[PDB]
Design a protein around this ligand. Structure first.
Ligand SMILES: C[C@H](C[C@@H](C[C@H](C[C@@H](C[C@@H](CCN1CCCC1=O)N1CCCC1=O)N1CCCC1=O)N1CCCC1=O)N1CCCC1=O)N1CCCC1=O
Ligand SMILES: C[C@H](C[C@@H](C[C@H](C[C@@H](C[C@@H](CCN1CCCC1=O)N1CCCC1=O)N1CCCC1=O)N1CCCC1=O)N1CCCC1=O)N1CCCC1=O
Ligand SMILES: C[C@H](C[C@@H](C[C@H](C[C@@H](C[C@@H](CCN1CCCC1=O)N1CCCC1=O)N1CCCC1=O)N1CCCC1=O)N1CCCC1=O)N1CCCC1=O
Ligand SMILES: C[C@H](C[C@@H](C[C@H](C[C@@H](C[C@@H](CCN1CCCC1=O)N1CCCC1=O)N1CCCC1=O)N1CCCC1=O)N1CCCC1=O)N1CCCC1=O
Ligand SMILES: C[C@H](C[C@@H](C[C@H](C[C@@H](C[C@@H](CCN1CCCC1=O)N1CCCC1=O)N1CCCC1=O)N1CCCC1=O)N1CCCC1=O)N1CCCC1=O
Ligand SMILES: C[C@H](C[C@@H](C[C@H](C[C@@H](C[C@@H](CCN1CCCC1=O)N1CCCC1=O)N1CCCC1=O)N1CCCC1=O)N1CCCC1=O)N1CCCC1=O
Ligand SMILES: C[C@H](C[C@@H](C[C@H](C[C@@H](C[C@@H](CCN1CCCC1=O)N1CCCC1=O)N1CCCC1=O)N1CCCC1=O)N1CCCC1=O)N1CCCC1=O
Ligand SMILES: C[C@H](C[C@@H](C[C@H](C[C@@H](C[C@@H](CCN1CCCC1=O)N1CCCC1=O)N1CCCC1=O)N1CCCC1=O)N1CCCC1=O)N1CCCC1=O
Ligand SMILES: COc1cc(CCNC(=O)c2nc(-c3ccccc3)[nH]c(=O)c2O)ccc1O
Ligand SMILES: COc1cc(CCNC(=O)c2nc(-c3ccccc3)[nH]c(=O)c2O)ccc1O
Ligand SMILES: COc1cc(CCNC(=O)c2nc(-c3ccccc3)[nH]c(=O)c2O)ccc1O
Ligand SMILES: COc1cc(CCNC(=O)c2nc(-c3ccccc3)[nH]c(=O)c2O)ccc1O
Ligand SMILES: COc1cc(CCNC(=O)c2nc(-c3ccccc3)[nH]c(=O)c2O)ccc1O
Ligand SMILES: N[C@@H](CCC(=O)O)C(=O)O
Ligand SMILES: N[C@@H](CCC(=O)O)C(=O)O
Ligand SMILES: N[C@@H](CCC(=O)O)C(=O)O
Ligand SMILES: N[C@@H](CCC(=O)O)C(=O)O
Ligand SMILES: N[C@@H](CCC(=O)O)C(=O)O
Ligand SMILES: N[C@@H](CCC(=O)O)C(=O)O
Ligand SMILES: N[C@@H](CCC(=O)O)C(=O)O
Ligand SMILES: N[C@@H](CCC(=O)O)C(=O)O
Ligand SMILES: [Mn+2]
Ligand SMILES: [Mn+2]
Ligand SMILES: [Mn+2]
Ligand SMILES: [Mn+2]
Ligand SMILES: [Mn+2]
Ligand SMILES: [Mn+2]
Ligand SMILES: [Mn+2]
Ligand SMILES: [Mn+2]
Ligand SMILES: [Mn+2]
Ligand SMILES: [Mn+2]
Ligand SMILES: [Mn+2]
Ligand SMILES: [Mn+2]
Lengths: 179, 179, 179, 179, 179, 179, 179, 179
């Protein structure tokens, strides 16, 4: 019940991302009070997706992650039925209105290119773009097309390494990298 | 009195657009509690006009729809008496400060090009631009000049199809497409 | 998915009570999109408990309903370990700091005194006070001790009958009284 | 169109009362831009009713005036079906939870006791309380039961005479007292 | 131009009282940048009047000080024409709705009873109550009727001595007590 | 005291511009309650200057109009002592950080080019730019350099003609054009 | 650096009390990141003092704790120089305007009566009231005069035991009770 | 204790910069009530750094100044470990995401080029950019690369000279230039 990682996650991310991660995890039958590593992972993924969507230019991205399952899908059908893009098999995170493709955002604790592989065998859809970030500071995207400019992606890497430092300062990073 | 479409409209659009649609419909002698399809249509038209005006660049559009009749006209006379453009016969929805022309925004449930025809015989003014959106996801504008960029108009189409899905999920879309 | 009762509940109660009812129902494995009658019941119970706690005088009641299970219990242990009152078997709704007893608030669709019976066999604790409200406008409390004054309890009855009227106007009240 | 009374009413009362008076007058087919005296009268009546309801003690009054017709009635049926009081023939302004009776609030430009007469022949219901205020500073209530204390009713009289002074300073009071 | 007392007054009182004192002093042809002692005196008088009006019970006092001359008078005529109290010769600060009399609030740097004398020869009206506060911590009122309870008047004295300490800490109190 | 123009000005412009105009007029010994035409003129000039400063790009203009005399000057000395531009003889309205020159904004009721003449004989400084707007919808600037783009200046003309229409609807425009 | 108690304190108390405790501890040369037990103690003491001051009736208490040393003293001199009460030797927490005495509030982890002893030998002033609360749920005050009513003091005890439970759930309570 | 410079600093800068300067000075063992010149210097440096960071384009700069020492460093390690830039020896003020270098911002009272020298011997790191501003209105940066455009840096110079004027008007500038 009383885990250091829970209090650290509640002290690290803003209340909105914490509430959204709690909702998304309870929806799939996972307890934030027990799966604390998955709690931190969901919060980090949500914040990274939000910074990514903010890195655009007003009407650039459509936020899919953070919506309810029935609602997050409804936007996918509306995007597909209006542009003509094939419907993805699994829920993505964003839709680039400038590139006419969905974006899958990953945040891994291992090296940058095995998580892309893991996300590539699962997807195997079509034009769905994959963008991977790592806590080490590296990144990797489809066709080397990193979608955003260098200044926006640098902020995501900096914030990612900031969370890694705060976890290690509380001896919680070693258990985070395992699972 | 107790109609599903009324509660759906109050749950779908934000309170400001709902209040503006109620005002605009009561002004013309129409009850939102009875003409629920017209209520949803007015709300959708208002939201589409607002997204259109937001798709500009700060000082780009002058919002005519959503103003009171005497006030909405007063801005039309001020626009005409300062630029020299001929006064339109019927109230438009916007004025493009970059193109020196008024814009008429339509949202139809039929195919995109019969509503443009219907709006073309009524207008027949001069340089008044016509821009039509459909729930199917298509669009059509005067001289193929769609005024806004592709990214802004895609958001309008996506949101339009989102409302169509929520209506069909409540079995209210079939009655909406009829009237 | 698209139920009239869902939109009516979202249009009737404020967003905070709706969110709290969604949380409380998802916690116990119940879907607000499917168990719409239970959704309305949870919202009504929450609002009645809140009006009851507001009917006091600043430092009068301690709100138990609407808190998370682990948190709502933690306040019960703190109340018991500081006053000396025996710990209740099941989660109550309030604690009267003026009467040194917990309060169980019920809102039933049947007559007022069978729900009290149903709540009396389940409880059978000790000094836990029971207060029952009905949609018909009647009420019943332990030892005829209605805790609050007449003016506060009249507001709860009035609001309860207001919800019953809005449900019947949408033909949703008959299905509500059944389950 | 451009009437001094309209601008004075918009400068005198707060925007909420002005909007509520506009809604209530448009509901009954009356134009605030044309019936400016009736506009000021509706605004004054609304503000007096609000100060009256504020003169209570938290859970004392139920505000009927300012609600929509279908909604304002729904609260009357809920009050009657829960307390047992006979349903009034015409819409009142408040309900005293402490006295178990409805209150009719009048604000007249003539002497205090002819408007009470006018309101007494129309009503003739039962326990519906009548409370009359005048711009001259006098008042009159049923059974000499003025419901509120002296300090609250003095504020209403003071504010009423303040509006009369501002009208006379703009030469609008003489036309107000006629109609 | 650059006076220590000006910056101290802007750092001591809240922006609203500072703005009201600036307005009241510019209305009578006095510069806050030059008459800095009168600036501090006006701010202190305004704050004392506000704490006094707050010391009541909701509908107790009518605030006269801090209003514009034409507006502050208009409330005096409305109070007199509705209660029957004789109109005062000079603008007072409050009106006690519970005692049916106006209140004149003074804040002096000399002893408490010479300022009352000075305010008594000027007034000499009728039932206008006089209440005097001093920076030394003493007070004096008409007929020993101090209107408010002991707890509210103690706060005013405490705050008054707090300002005297902050002035002396900046060597500005000696010049304040002179003028 | 009770002038139609006063209530119209309070109903037309936002409270901030009204307060700033009241301050600026009381500073120079002019009463807004008496010099109502000058009141409307000051409000219009302030709003036009604000729209002009907003027409830039974040760090483009430095707002001089609307500041207190001693403060509005202090910014002029700071601008001159840091850029090297000669100090103007009379207070301007803006400073263009992109053009290294002050801007004088005029709003006249006569034709556009006699007010520029009137403002040119008074100024006769150096690089101080003059920009004139008229209620008729025309404009005129130094060296035909209109500083802003066409879309921003069109909004100012439209709003100017909107105020002219509202004045004429209340029969206040004829007296406005005289003085 | 990374202590569980720090994150727990930041997750438990509101940001204002946390900031005030950080300020008060840095003022006396103590690090909240190192003296985490003292951090939690300062936060708990501040919250208890705030609930105590809120337990009064508007103008009842004067808050001394939470102010800066020079400021917190300045209010003590102002209270003494206006009421005549002897100046205390050490900074208290409140001043009861109804009882004409200062209040010292203690929150101990041991039994209730040894901390009162410890606070009695240190004080030994005069009429300075001592009120002690414990995490076990007991209390003790001077002359058995508990100042507040039973309902307000019960809330403090309940909240105190809530913090003790959350500490023990994170295995931080055992180290808290030691120091 | 009562210094003119303290009140001037509290009247000049916004409360946030004042609080941040108080925190930063108390962290290094310096009293704002005593080291008033250093207080004004810290406030000016903070405001200049904030205007500099605002002069960018959304995701351009990372604010280092104004953060706590342990936190301000944590961002430096995250920036270095993600971009590959060498870690600076002393805490900088910003990081330019567009130029891949840290920025050191200085505000001196002497001539612009001796403070750059003083900051150059201390630094002597690598690609750390130095940008110096002066109260006289001049500036100097590394490689004549002033990072921002001319319009943003002109605002900083103007505001700097505004503070110098307000200090001299209160006879506080001469003592400021000495230390
Ligand atoms: C309002 C919400 C829209 C976005 C919310 C998302 C989160 C944003 C938080 C905001 C506040 N900001 C922006 C400035 C700083 C800050 O704190 N954050 C948090 C991490 C970084 C960030 O940018 N963003 C991004 C753009 C602006 C905004 O608000 N979300 C949430 C999920 C779905 C969605 O669209 N909506 C719209 C309707 C439903 C809803 O929840
Ligand atoms: C304030 C209003 C100006 C606009 C209002 C219009 C609606 C806007 C709602 C706003 C809030 N936003 C913007 C971000 C999200 C949001 O929720 N929406 C709702 C649908 C999408 C949208 O953009 N917009 C658009 C630009 C910003 C703004 O506010 N309107 C209303 C009718 C006349 C008018 O000009 N005004 C000005 C004075 C009178 C008045 O009512
Ligand atoms: C803030 C919350 C405290 C209460 C919330 C509860 C609900 C209240 C809504 C408020 C707003 N009001 C009051 C005026 C009108 C209104 O809309 N409503 C809604 C129905 C009627 C009512 O009174 N009340 C009641 C007293 C004031 C208040 O806010 N709750 C929610 C569950 C736990 C709890 O204690 N807290 C405290 C910390 C955690 C939290 O969520
Ligand atoms: C919120 C509303 C509740 C009341 C509104 C009514 C008006 C009140 C304005 C408020 C703000 N205050 C109170 C302090 C000063 C002020 O400006 N005024 C204006 C004139 C004097 C006054 O007291 N009052 C009175 C009690 C508090 C309140 O808000 N109303 C409006 C009609 C129906 C109703 O119940 N509600 C509830 C849900 C629907 C709605 O509109
Ligand atoms: C709103 C205003 C009403 C009062 C303003 C007066 C000042 C009050 C400031 C308020 C905020 N509070 C109250 C809590 C703390 C605080 O900071 N202060 C400042 C000093 C102490 C105090 O209580 N008070 C007192 C009662 C509540 C209120 O707001 N005033 C100002 C002059 C005329 C008037 O009636 N109004 C009404 C319409 C016009 C206007 O300006
Ligand atoms: C805050 C103020 C800065 C500006 C104020 C000026 C007025 C602006 C009103 C604002 C709100 N907006 C902007 C969106 C709509 C709106 O209503 N309006 C009113 C008319 C049109 C307009 O844009 N503007 C313009 C830029 C943003 C802003 O706020 N002013 C006032 C005089 C001096 C000054 O610099 N400041 C700064 C410190 C002192 C002060 O008063
Ligand atoms: C504003 C402040 C006044 C008090 C602050 C104190 C804290 C209060 C927090 C408030 C918000 N509330 C009240 C409702 C819930 C809530 O969250 N809390 C936190 C714990 C419980 C509580 O009641 N209280 C108590 C009365 C109202 C108030 O605000 N304080 C802080 C130290 C000095 C002081 O007087 N002031 C005045 C000027 C300087 C300053 O900081
Ligand atoms: C929120 C804060 C972010 C920045 C704060 C900084 C100060 C800014 C004040 C803001 C309000 N504005 C902007 C418009 C006018 C105004 O008054 N000012 C004051 C001087 C000029 C200025 O632009 N800025 C600059 C960009 C926007 C913003 O807010 N800061 C403070 C130190 C660390 C930091 O990043 N944060 C983020 C999380 C922690 C925190 O404190
Ligand atoms: C059961 O897990 C969840 C599943 C979902 C549905 C959609 N899922 C994602 O969008 C997603 N989710 C993770 C990720 C990885 C590890 C732990 C937690 C989340 N990584 C990603 O790259 C990614 O696109 C939402 C929230 C969840 O918690
Ligand atoms: C009586 O109807 C209304 C009329 C008006 C006046 C101006 N009208 C429009 O601006 C408009 N209105 C619809 C439309 C179509 C069907 C139903 C409702 C609205 N479509 C459009 O393209 C369009 O330009 C305002 C609100 C109304 O409700
Ligand atoms: C006494 O008058 C005022 C003077 C001032 C000082 C600076 N003045 C202007 O900045 C200004 N003022 C008007 C103008 C013209 C007619 C009536 C009112 C204002 N026109 C302009 O073009 C213009 O630059 C400020 C506010 C005033 O009211
Ligand atoms: C150095 O310590 C502090 C001292 C001060 C000055 C005034 N002190 C109190 O007002 C106080 N302080 C604690 C207490 C006990 C243990 C740890 C922390 C605080 N207990 C009490 O009963 C109590 O009246 C303010 C904040 C501090 O952190
Ligand atoms: C002890 O002093 C402080 C030191 C610090 C740590 C980082 N320091 C700066 O970032 C900094 N500080 C000054 C400066 C110069 C004179 C007086 C005050 C500050 N000038 C600069 O250019 C500059 O980069 C933060 C706040 C301080 O008060
Ligand atoms: N065990 C985790 C490791 C991946 C990660 O932490 O990103 C899965 O697979
Ligand atoms: N009956 C409607 C159909 C058009 C529409 O729904 O858009 C008219 O004509
Ligand atoms: N079937 C429900 C009826 C009770 C109620 O609706 O309150 C149970 O038992
Ligand atoms: N002619 C109006 C007069 C009553 C009133 O003004 O109050 C009716 O009858
Ligand atoms: N010279 C001032 C003294 C009175 C006061 O300061 O209160 C007058 O008379
Ligand atoms: N009589 C005014 C006319 C100019 C104007 O109205 O703009 C001056 O000269
Ligand atoms: N060692 C601490 C114990 C007291 C307490 O924790 O309250 C002192 O003495
Ligand atoms: N004595 C100060 C002067 C530098 C400055 O004021 O900027 C150091 O060195
Ligand atoms: Mn996803
Ligand atoms: Mn993803
Ligand atoms: Mn239209
Ligand atoms: Mn249209
Ligand atoms: Mn219950
Ligand atoms: Mn009435
Ligand atoms: Mn006085
Ligand atoms: Mn000017
Ligand atoms: Mn000008
Ligand atoms: Mn204490
Ligand atoms: Mn620095
Ligand atoms: Mn620096």
């Amino acid at each position: 019940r009383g885990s250091h990682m829970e209090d650290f996650v509640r002290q690290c991310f803003n209340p909105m991302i914490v509430e959204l991660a709690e909702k998304a995890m309870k929806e799939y039958g996972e307890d934030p009070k027990i799966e604390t590593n998955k709690f931190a992972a969901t919060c980090t993924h949500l914040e990274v997706c939000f910074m990514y969507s903010d890195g655009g230019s007003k009407h650039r991205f459509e936020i899919i992650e953070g919506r309810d399952r029935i609602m997050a899908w409804t936007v996918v059908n509306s995007i597909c039925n209006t542009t003509g893009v094939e419907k993805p098999k699994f829920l993505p995170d964003l839709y680039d209105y400038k590139e006419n493709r969905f974006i899958e955002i990953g945040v891994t604790r291992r090296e940058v290119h095995i998580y892309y592989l893991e996300k590539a065998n699962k997807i195997k859809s079509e034009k769905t773009h994959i963008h991977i970030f790592s806590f080490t500071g590296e990144e990797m995207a489809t066709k080397a097309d990193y979608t955003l400019d260098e200044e926006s992606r640098a902020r995501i890497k900096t914030r990612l390494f900031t969370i890694r430092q705060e976890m290690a300062s509380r001896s919680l990073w070693d258990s985070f990298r395992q699972s």
